[PDB]
Ligand binder design. Structure first.
Ligand SMILES: Nc1nc2c(ncn2[C@@H]2O[C@H](COP(=O)(O)OP(=O)(O)OP(=O)(O)O)[C@@H](O)[C@H]2O)c(=O)[nH]1
Ligand SMILES: Nc1nc2c(ncn2[C@@H]2O[C@H](COP(=O)(O)OP(=O)(O)O)[C@@H](O)[C@H]2O)c(=O)[nH]1
Ligand SMILES: [Ca+2]
Ligand SMILES: [Mg+2]
Lengths: 421, 440, 67
């Protein structure tokens, strides 16, 4: 077995974590009691990747629930499946983080962090062969961004040879008015560039634009947004959860997707929000991206495409050849064969045919530039720096997060402009 | 005597080992439990099939084979599959964590944790042999285990067994079934590391096998199961001279003399015919002339390249089944007049011929028609260098920007190993040029 | 001719031995250099994660110093 340890931190972190476990519990035939009431044996082949086996044939999520405020905790318990999580795996504080990254990272979170680390070790030392970790969290609040990135660096100190994978939710002014959000996101992005191996960029600004323009929701709720997220997280973990060949594990994904250690921020896509050509065309369309960047404004370093359902594999092969041929100028030519595709037989619930798209595109710089511009609109005024200097933070620590993210954008531009000859 | 030990490394190597030993068992009348009613010599013997099978006192015929993978899932299917009674558990070696498509992990980080165990298990097979002839190593170029672990193994075998011969069956990567974008890196590293340690290496281009299945067997989207069953037929033809007796049976080693004019020029091109479906073989008997002619059709080669635009240094014909020399000699004589067959000026132009009278077998539920006669041609042409050229080009595109190179450096490798490996490949492509120039 | 015959067979032996020897030393050299390298890249990774902890002390020390 290749185990993943799952970590949820903060307001956003725990809500999208709950719906992930509901969706894959259902796909794997596991009810809110940890009992297997499933149809086919393919649901249990790789069940050990996300589940511990408790006797009484009970499958318990290998999940660690974390927050500096008990409110989000108590909601998960009463939620659907709340009683499938190991009770000891809840680790909550009281003070909270008040949407302050320095409270999550340096002070409040630092007081609670050593208590979460104890839980990581129990789940980790109990692993036959630990793949690594996946974090869910926002980059705009305080616990998810600050303590979430503190817990990354701490976990990396103790398991430097494991893969660190994060699902990072990014703030849009269309989703939250909390003015200090371009600060928190820029400070954790500074951390994500140094200390993770793979980050799925889950952009609230794209989820909002999807719900309103495509789904046609005048007032999309955090419940609407998280529907798109659960479908995406089920998509991009399909290769980890069911028998298969390519990207069967987190290290092989990293090796195939990350040509340069810092350029590890992925643009996810999903379709439908259908025939095999429509699925292929949609999953490559800017309107089905979860990162709010137009791919035709950059170039793909690498791409992973997961098709789910019963469909002709000859047809999928020809359609994926088709899209590269007709879109050839948008894939870098110095990485041959940089598009891999997988077909898994079980579709998500509700759908007969789905496609999930994972892109490493230099157009992700569009997402980092929208944040950088909001960061400096405040920083050049020194607006709200007291919430941070008051926690003990230096000013050139903001300057450094800034220049590092500006550097990440320059390096995406560097490889977008690169040629073979 | 004259025993051969087979070593199956990584997913491709293991799974092609499943296909080959299943085919061998059907060719020799060995049951899945290993009993062989025909062998009247209980507990041993010196029959031709004993080069590939040892015998227990309880009647079991046991492959002289080791399977190795750095993860367990592929070899676990051998342990529970149809032929699980065939192998002693100690012949089936697995770790817990694979090479993650990374040569450095196969050669150093992971593989160094299992190499002593593997060499111990090979040593236990070698000590059953009264006259060990050599090893047959099966592995992909593309996987982290097939590339990195295999070459760690080849170096260790040169040490433990000196100049004892080592033959390779090597799966050259194809985009239609590849698993990693870094297969060109792994390919060039293992080719560089293994070159001095291998005597003869039969390359199998997955795209050539893939096209043959699509075009000749009407499989719209071939699987590894489709590809392996064709691959085993070619492997079976190359090893049949070792496993069967015959008046006209020429030993593989004797073809080897003709196939390798210089140590580094040791990559024969394989071509097999007939590859034909049951539906189309029906009422259609393919003669010695027809299948011989099919061997000079480039669409029937194990490796994509054009021997019409290279030069021959050797041409061997390995027939099996209903074939007599007169027919062979006539078929060859018409191919010479009608075909584009230019030899380098420094070697004779004859074709070396072997005939094994045991006819080809097919595995139940396969797509190959069962036929009365088959041929594997092994030629040494300068054109096989095209396959090096294609892989070297893909390597250069990525290495010029150092794409993915950090995954290897993080595992302890240095850039100088990449450039050193790539220069050996440049020099190898140049060797293939020079052997083809006329003398003075 | 006898002395020439034993020289030839001594040479074959001497060459097989030298090949085994050099392969043996090439390998131990590679495995040792690769262990040093892998260990140095890990040690450098820990060294700067441990700098993150020295800076986390420095930052908590400022929040008391300034209060
Ligand atoms: N013909 C054939 N080729 C295969 C088969 N399995 C894998 N391959 C080839 O092997 C290449 C990748 O190497 P693998 O052997 O799968 O990897 P590995 O040996 O298990 O080493 P790891 O990367 O550590 O898992 C792919 O490009 C495939 O073309 C097979 O069953 N038949
Ligand atoms: N997509 C999505 N984003 C969320 C959700 N909850 C919070 N966020 C985002 O997270 C940011 C605030 O971080 P928060 O989750 O409150 O951190 P926490 O309170 O410490 O756990 C806001 O900018 C929101 O846009 C959610 O359920 N879905
Ligand atoms: Ca016998
Ligand atoms: Mg493998």
């Amino acid at each position: 077995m290749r185990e993943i340890v799952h970590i949820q931190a903060g307001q956003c972190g725990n809500q999208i974590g709950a719906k992930f476990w509901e969706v894959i519990s259902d796909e794997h035939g596991i009810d809110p009691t940890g009992s297997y009431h499933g149809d086919s044996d393919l649901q249990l082949e790789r069940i050990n990747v996300y589940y511990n086996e408790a006797t009484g044939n009970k499958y318990v999520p290998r999940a660690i629930l974390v927050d500096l405020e008990p409110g989000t905790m108590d909601s998960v318990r009463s939620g659907p499946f709340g009683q499938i999580f190991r009770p000891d795996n809840f680790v909550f504080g009281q003070s909270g983080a008040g949407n302050n990254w320095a409270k999550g990272h340096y002070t409040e979170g630092a007081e609670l962090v050593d208590s979460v680390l104890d839980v990581v070790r129990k789940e980790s030392e109990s692993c036959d062969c630990l793949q690594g970790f996946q974090l869910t969290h926002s980059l705009g609040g305080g616990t998810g961004s600050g303590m979430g990135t503190l817990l990354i660096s701490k976990i990396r100190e103790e398991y430097p040879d494991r893969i660190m994978n994060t699902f990072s939710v990014m703030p849009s002014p269309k989703v939250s008015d909390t003015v200090v959000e371009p600060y928190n996101a820029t400070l954790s992005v500074h951390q994500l560039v140094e200390n993770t191996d793979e980050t799925y960029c889950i952009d609230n600004e794209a989820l909002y634009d999807i719900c309103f323009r495509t789904l046609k929701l005048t007032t999309p709720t955090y419940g609407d947004l998280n529907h798109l997220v659960s479908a995406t997280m089920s998509g991009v973990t399909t290769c980890l959860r069911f028998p298969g060949q390519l990207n069967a594990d987190l290290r092989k994904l990293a090796v195939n997707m990350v040509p340069f250690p810092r350029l590890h921020f992925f643009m996810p896509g999903f379709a439908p929000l259908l025939t095999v050509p429509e699925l292929t065309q949609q999953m490559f369309d800017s309107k089905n991206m979860m990162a709010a960047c137009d791919p035709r404004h950059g170039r793909y370093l690498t791409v992973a495409a997961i098709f789910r359902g019963r469909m002709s594999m000859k047809e999928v092969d020809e359609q994926m050849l088709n899209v590269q041929n007709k879109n050839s100028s948008y894939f870098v030519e110095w990485i041959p064969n940089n598009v891999k595709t997988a077909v898994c037989d079980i579709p998500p619930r509700g759908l007969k045919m789905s496609a999930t798209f994972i892109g490493n595109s230099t157009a992700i710089q569009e997402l980092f530039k929208r944040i950088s511009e909001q960061f400096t609109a405040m920083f050049r005024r020194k607006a709200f720096l007291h919430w941070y200097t008051g926690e003990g933070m230096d000013e050139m620590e903001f300057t450094e997060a800034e220049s590092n993210m500006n550097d990440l954008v320059s390096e995406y531009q560097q490889y977008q402009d690169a040629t073979a000859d | 005597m004259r025993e051969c030990i087979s070593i199956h490394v990584g997913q491709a190597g293991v799974q092609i080992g499943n296909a080959c030993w299943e085919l061998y068992c059907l060719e020799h009348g060995i049951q899945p439990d290993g009993q062989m009613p025909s062998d009247k010599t209980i507990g041993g013997g010196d029959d031709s099939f004993n080069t590939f099978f040892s015998e227990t006192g309880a009647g079991k015929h046991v492959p002289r084979a080791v399977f190795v993978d750095l993860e367990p899932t592929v070899i676990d299917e051998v342990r529970t599959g149809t032929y699980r009674q065939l192998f002693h558990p100690e012949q089936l070696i697995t770790g817990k964590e694979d090479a993650a498509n990374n040569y450095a992990r196969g050669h150093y980080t992971i593989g160094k944790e299992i190499i002593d165990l593997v060499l111990d298990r090979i040593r236990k097979l070698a000590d059953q042999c009264t006259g060990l002839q050599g090893f047959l190593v099966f592995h992909s170029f593309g996987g982290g285990t097939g590339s990195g672990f295999t070459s760690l193994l080849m170096e260790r075998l040169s040490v433990d067994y000196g100049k004892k011969s080592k033959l390779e069956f090597s799966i050259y990567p194809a985009p239609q079934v590849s698993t990693a974008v870094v297969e060109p890196y792994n390919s060039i590293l293992t080719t560089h590391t293994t070159l001095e340690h291998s005597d003869c290496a039969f390359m199998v281009d997955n795209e050539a096998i893939y096209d043959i299945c699509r075009r000749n067997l009407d499989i719209e989207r071939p699987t590894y199961t489709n590809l392996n069953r064709l691959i085993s037929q070619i492997v079976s033809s190359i090893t049949a001279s070792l496993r069967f007796d015959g008046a006209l049976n020429v030993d593989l080693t004797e073809f080897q003399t003709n196939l390798v004019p210089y140590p580094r020029i040791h990559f024969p091109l394989a071509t097999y015919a007939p590859v034909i479906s049951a539906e189309k073989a029906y009422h259609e008997q393919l003669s010695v002339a027809e299948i011989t002619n099919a061997c000079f059709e480039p669409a029937n080669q194990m490796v994509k390249c054009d021997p019409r635009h290279g030069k021959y240094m050797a041409c061997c014909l390995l027939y099996r089944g209903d074939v007599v020399p007169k027919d062979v000699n006539a078929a060859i004589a018409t191919i010479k007049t009608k075909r584009s067959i230019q030899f380098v000026d420094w070697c004779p132009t004859g074709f070396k011929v072997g005939i094994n009278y045991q006819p080809p077998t097919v595995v139940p539920g396969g797509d190959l028609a069962k036929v009365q006669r088959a041929v594997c041609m092994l030629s040494n042409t300068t054109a096989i260098a095209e396959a090096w050229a294609r892989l070297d080009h893909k390597f250069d595109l990525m290495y010029a920007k150092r794409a993915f190179v950090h995954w290897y450096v993080g595992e302890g490798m240095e850039e100088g190993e990449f450039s050193e490996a790539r220069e050996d490949m440049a020099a190898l492509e140049k060797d293939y040029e020079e052997v083809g120039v006329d003398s003075v | 001719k006898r002395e020439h015959e034993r020289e030839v067979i001594q040479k074959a032996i001497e060459e097989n031995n030298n090949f085994i020897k050099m392969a043996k030393e090439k390998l131990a050299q590679k495995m040792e250099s690769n262990k040093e390298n892998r260990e140095a890249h890990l040690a450098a990774m820990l060294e700067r994660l441990q700098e993150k902890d020295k800076h986390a002390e420095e930052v908590r020390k400022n929040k008391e110093l300034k209060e």
